[PDB]
């Protein structure tokens, strides 16, 4: 980003993502509703600490010079005129604005001063989430296996990238010619062999992921139906202003039909359980929404 971002996330996942990214940099979470927002802002500006500010709908115009980067360089210092006092702006300072209302309106100057980042739910993401949820609920072993394989594939790809980079670095760093020093040959042989077993692990994890994909194909229509149902729920606000439903409502409906379903007490067949889950999903969605 060039302009300081403004995050729109009703679910609140983006806020936690930002706090996790800047946790090592000692990010401070505050709000415009806090009376002492000035003190936190000044401390962040002076010490160059990342800052996350919530409730941007109550935006404080004191941030206008900060957002506009209206700095005054003089004598090696970078001065920012927050209010009536001058503050040495550390280059490591960064501010993120966040809100949980996707329907909030902003004045044009605020729209100009920030980089809007909208975290909206998509059909593919919702389908993936619902598929993962149903796999965890009905086939916990398969879900655990899938998580383990995703972790292993991530680690294996990291290892392959590191090995390729190290091999290129070693070939670049030779002060002379390869066979002059045997340690170069040792390093190249080690890197190539490591790439070998990591690749073999890649094919074995790939075939296990293939069987995991095959066993999970049965629950895809349920995830598609979940996405369609939720996006019908979200579009219900077009016919009446009172029909405001969040993603957490549909997630609660899905959790109720999965775990708190009275019709799954004695049923053990997977196909029967899936059919019951679909029927009761439609029934519970209508019952709760209407």
């Amino acid at each position: 980003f060039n302009r300081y971002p403004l995050i729109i996330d009703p679910s609140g996942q983006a806020t936690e993502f930002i706090m996790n990214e800047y946790k090592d940099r000692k990010i401070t979470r505050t709000s415009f509703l806090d009376d002492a927002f000035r003190k936190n802002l000044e401390s962040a500006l002076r010490f160059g600490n990342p800052l996350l500010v919530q409730d941007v709908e109550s935006y404080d115009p004191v941030l206008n010079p900060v957002l506009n980067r209206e700095v005054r360089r003089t004598g090696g210092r970078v001065l920012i005129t927050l209010g009536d006092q001058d503050i040495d702006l550390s280059p490591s300072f960064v501010i993120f604005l966040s809100t949980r209302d996707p329907t909030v309106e902003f004045p044009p100057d605020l729209c100009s001063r920030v980089t809007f980042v909208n975290f909206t739910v998509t059909r593919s993401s919702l389908q993936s989430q619902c598929l993962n949820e149903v796999l965890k609920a009905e086939r916990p072993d398969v879900d655990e296996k899938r998580s383990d394989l995703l972790k292993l594939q991530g680690e294996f790809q990291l290892r392959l990238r590191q090995l390729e980079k190290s091999l290129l670095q070693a070939l670049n760093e030779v002060k002379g010619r390869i066979l002059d020093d045997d340690t170069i040959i040792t390093t190249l042989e080690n890197l190539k062999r490591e790439a070998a077993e990591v690749t073999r692990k890649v094919e074995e994890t790939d075939i296990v992921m293939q069987e995991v994909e095959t066993v999970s194909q049965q629950y895809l229509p349920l995830s598609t139906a979940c996405s369609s149902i939720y996006f019908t729920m979200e579009s219900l606000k077009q016919i009446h202003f009172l029909y405001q439903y969040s993603l957490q409502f549909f997630l609660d409906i899905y959790h109720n039909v999965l775990y708190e379903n009275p019709n799954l007490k004695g049923v053990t067949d997977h196909t029967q359980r899936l059919s019951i889950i679909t029927k009761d999903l439609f029934q519970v969605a209508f019952n709760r929404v209407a």
Binding site: S31, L33, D34, D35, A36, K39, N40, S43
Partner: protein, 322 residues
């Protein structure tokens, strides 16, 4: 040991010494039989007052800790330090769950409202601020003091907060409407410490001062204010009048409080002594050579017969009462 008459006695029980800097304040845990002391080494050590055994240290503050307090349940500890920060401690897990900034200078006092959902603090920038426990947001800023505000203490029901400052005055504020109910100005020097009168002493205070019984039935909140002119004054918040002046300390008064039974006044000063006052006769009964240097604070346990006094000699002492 009369269930509401014990006073501390010169044979000390334990003299706990683990602090590397002068002890600022000492308090008692309302529920557990545990004692907490804050010092100037940015540490908040936790002691057991029955066996006199150190338990653990609560670090995290950058500069000297100036005040500590517990909520009614004892499940939260609020501490303020000289680094302009107020920290909320989860006393079950002994971790700092929230750090609150916003004061412009040294914060010299902190207290948790009786409802437990707000934190009141006083600092050197001549302001008193109120913070939410859940969110940590500042919601009020009681301005009006002309100098460094040293103490802030809410009353029993939490509707009133009293404060003392270097401006030689004691102010009583209304939490709901932020107005200054009264400005008690009779001390000739800087006021150090204040304390509210418990409901169990209202009748005793009314009969000692000769105050006629009000037709409302409530004698009105009573306030004490130890100051550096070596005097202790009892006030009537409703009328703004000084009921009595207690004389007898040889130096600046650092702490003052009532006996939980509401029959005596316990106060510590920089004259190295801890004194028990009989406000019925406006005279001092017993004087204890508490420490070998200045005595910074004292606390009186609500039920158990025990008194704790912190001091600048880096020693925290527990006194048996008989």
């Amino acid at each position: 040991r009369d269930p509401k008459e014990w006073i501390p006695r010169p044979p000390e029980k334990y003299a706990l010494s683990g602090h590397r800097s002068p002890v600022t304040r000492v308090i008692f845990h309302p529920v557990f039989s545990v004692m907490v002391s804050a010092s100037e080494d940015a540490t908040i050590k936790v002691w057991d007052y029955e066996t006199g055994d150190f338990e653990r240290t609560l670090k995290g503050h950058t500069d000297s800790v100036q005040d500590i307090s517990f909520d009614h349940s004892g499940k939260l500890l609020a501490s303020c330090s000289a680094d302009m920060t107020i920290k909320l401690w989860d006393f079950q897990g002994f971790e700092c769950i929230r750090t609150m900034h916003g004061h412009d200078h040294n914060v010299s006092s902190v207290a948790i409202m009786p409802n437990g959902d707000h934190i009141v603090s006083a600092s050197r920038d001549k302001t008193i601020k109120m913070w939410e426990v859940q969110t940590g947001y500042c919601v009020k800023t009681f301005t009006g003091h002309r100098e460094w505000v040293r103490m802030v203490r809410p009353n029993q029901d939490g509707t009133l907060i009293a404060s003392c400052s270097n401006d030689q005055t004691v102010r009583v504020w209304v939490v709901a409407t932020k107005e200054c109910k009264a400005e008690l100005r009779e001390h000739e020097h800087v006021v150090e410490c204040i304390s509210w009168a418990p409901e169990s002493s209202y009748s005793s205070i009314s009969e000692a001062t000769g105050s006629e019984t009000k037709k409302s039935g409530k004698p009105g909140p009573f306030l004490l204010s130890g100051s550096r002119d070596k005097t202790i004054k009892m006030w009537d918040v409703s009328t703004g009048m000084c009921l009595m002046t207690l004389v007898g300390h040889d130096n600046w008064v650092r702490g003052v409080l009532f006996h939980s039974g509401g029959k005596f006044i316990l106060s510590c000063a920089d004259d190295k002594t801890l004194r028990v006052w009989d406000y019925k006769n406006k005279r001092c009964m017993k004087t204890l050579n508490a420490h070998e240097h200045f005595v910074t604070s004292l606390d009186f346990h609500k039920t158990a017969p025990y008194v704790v006094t912190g001091s600048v000699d880096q020693t925290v002492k527990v006194w048996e009462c008989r």
